[PDB]
Carbonic Anhydrase 2 (Homo sapiens), 258 residues
Amino acid sequence: HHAGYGKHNGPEHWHKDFPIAKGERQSPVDIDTHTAKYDPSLKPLSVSYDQATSLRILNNGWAFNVEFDDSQDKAVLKGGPLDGTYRLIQFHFHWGSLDGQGSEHTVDKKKYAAELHLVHWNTKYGDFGKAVQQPDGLAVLGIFLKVGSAKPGLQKVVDVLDSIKTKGKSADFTNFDPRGLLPESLDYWTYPGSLTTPPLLECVTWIVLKEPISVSSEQVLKFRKLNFNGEGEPEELMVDNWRPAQPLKNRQIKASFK
Ligand SMILES: [Zn+2]
């Protein structure tokens, strides 16, 4: 009996096992576009994914992760609010049971159909395990998904989902280019936050892009065919695996644009 996204083990229960759930810098949060202030000190954001090396895709009962080889300095995120180099380790999505919900962060209370999280860790801390124990250990690039035209660069991911339908299943996923999941503009809000799943460590600098990518209804539907459960157990569809907006508390969201 562990945390999850159900009525008896959902986000509202998670504080019992993880007190930090009611912390001072939890995510996600609602982004009030009118209160977010342009920050001149922010340097240009640099997303260098040309040498990215994907290796596997895994259904971990919470989402599916496309894992990358981070044993070396290849796919990195730098600049913006960021000091030093952050290495891409994995990316995953959160999505809903319907197009009207699914994203973790919200924009003026608006909920998107889904949200992509590209997770990177600060190389100054040597490894991901050590990085999550630091306030500036992680940088997560957040990208909203809306339903409309299909995203060509996402189809490769959609096509393998049938092979990792249940919790614990994984499949080879080499040569996938994450650049195909990026929107045209790199305009972003930024604020200090957490992991959005247990253990909810407040080790994350959040970079959330303003421009959404569009995915087809067909692509998201195949998201919704995944299972939270393991092979051979009662089918629980993997839908609404998102944590709701959390109190902003003593934080300010900064904008990279005007
Ligand atoms: Zn996430």
About this structure: The two ends are 47 Å apart (CA to CA). Helices lie at 128-131, 155-160, 217-223.
